[PDB]
Design an enzyme around this catalytic site. Structure first.
Site, PDB file in Angstrom:
ATOM      1  N   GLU A  11       0.952  -0.804  -0.076  1.00  0.00           N
ATOM      2  CA  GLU A  11      -0.233   0.346  -0.455  1.00  0.00           C
ATOM      3  C   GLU A  11       0.788   1.271   0.049  1.00  0.00           C
ATOM      4  O   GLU A  11       0.199   2.434  -0.450  1.00  0.00           O
ATOM      5  CB  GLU A  11      -0.303  -0.266   1.094  1.00  0.00           C
ATOM      6  CG  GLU A  11      -1.881  -1.172   1.334  1.00  0.00           C
ATOM      7  CD  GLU A  11      -2.685  -0.772   0.656  1.00  0.00           C
ATOM      8  OE1 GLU A  11      -3.806  -2.188   0.279  1.00  0.00           O
ATOM      9  OE2 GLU A  11      -3.118   0.417   0.607  1.00  0.00           O
ATOM     10  N   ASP A  20      -6.923   6.164  -4.387  1.00  0.00           N
ATOM     11  CA  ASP A  20      -6.403   4.656  -4.690  1.00  0.00           C
ATOM     12  C   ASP A  20      -6.784   4.353  -5.791  1.00  0.00           C
ATOM     13  O   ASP A  20      -7.138   5.333  -7.172  1.00  0.00           O
ATOM     14  CB  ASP A  20      -7.406   3.942  -3.461  1.00  0.00           C
ATOM     15  CG  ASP A  20      -8.139   3.536  -4.006  1.00  0.00           C
ATOM     16  OD1 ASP A  20      -9.016   2.506  -2.878  1.00  0.00           O
ATOM     17  OD2 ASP A  20      -9.137   3.744  -4.579  1.00  0.00           O
ATOM     18  N   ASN A 132      -8.006 -20.436  -9.636  1.00  0.00           N
ATOM     19  CA  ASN A 132      -9.193 -20.337  -9.306  1.00  0.00           C
ATOM     20  C   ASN A 132      -9.168 -18.440  -8.403  1.00  0.00           C
ATOM     21  O   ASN A 132      -9.860 -17.628  -9.308  1.00  0.00           O
ATOM     22  CB  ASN A 132      -9.834 -21.177  -8.677  1.00  0.00           C
ATOM     23  CG  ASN A 132     -10.927 -20.052  -8.735  1.00  0.00           C
ATOM     24  OD1 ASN A 132     -11.519 -19.437  -7.708  1.00  0.00           O
ATOM     25  ND2 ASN A 132     -11.729 -21.056  -9.116  1.00  0.00           N
TER      26      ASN A 132
END
Ligand SMILES: [Cl-]
Ligand SMILES: [Cl-]
Length: 162
Positions: A11, A20, A132
């Protein structure tokens, strides 16, 4: 390596309000302020979070304090969620960090939605879960970060972050 260092790398740290990856007002170490398009609403949320009239800028210390709270909240969110809790309990310590990261980025609800992936992690079918997990908006929108997180689920080591 640990969860805090891991998230600090993903971050970054900004002491002034910024937008963001999705365009939402944020501050500090990935602390979302509001989804609202208004800077003012953002500033208001910031002041209420810090407890002072801020001017849109905070100190390092304030940023760390919101960071600690946010990590604590992500964990509790997992522990309280019926779908997440069993997964988290089944994982080793390194992989647990990967799950916290995802919840920190997208929220409990969001993660809880990866039904099939979660079942594969619980079964310890790492490569299958990795594929997945990749078929997701999350992966397509923030691929480098997702690749790091997925590599952790695949390997159980911190190499992706080193
Ligand atoms: Cl808060
Ligand atoms: Cl990315």
């Amino acid at each position: 390596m640990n969860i805090f260092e891991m998230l600090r790398i993903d971050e970054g740290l900004r002491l002034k309000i910024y937008k963001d990856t999705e365009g939402y007002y944020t501050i500090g170490i990935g602390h979302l302020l509001t989804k609202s398009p208004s800077l003012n609403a953002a500033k208001s949320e910031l002041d209420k979070a810090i407890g002072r009239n801020t001017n849109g800028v905070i100190t390092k210390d304030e940023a760390e304090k919101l960071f600690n709270q946010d990590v604590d909240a992500a964990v509790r969110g997992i522990l309280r969620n019926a779908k997440l809790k069993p997964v988290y309990d089944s994982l080793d310590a390194v992989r647990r960090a990967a799950l916290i990261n995802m919840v920190f980025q997208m929220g409990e609800t969001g993660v809880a939605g990866f039904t099939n992936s979660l079942r594969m992690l619980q079964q310890k079918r790492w490569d299958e879960a990795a594929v997945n997990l990749a078929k997701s908006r999350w992966y397509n929108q923030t691929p480098n970060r997702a690749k790091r997180v997925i590599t952790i689920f695949r390997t159980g080591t911190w190499d992706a972050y080193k």
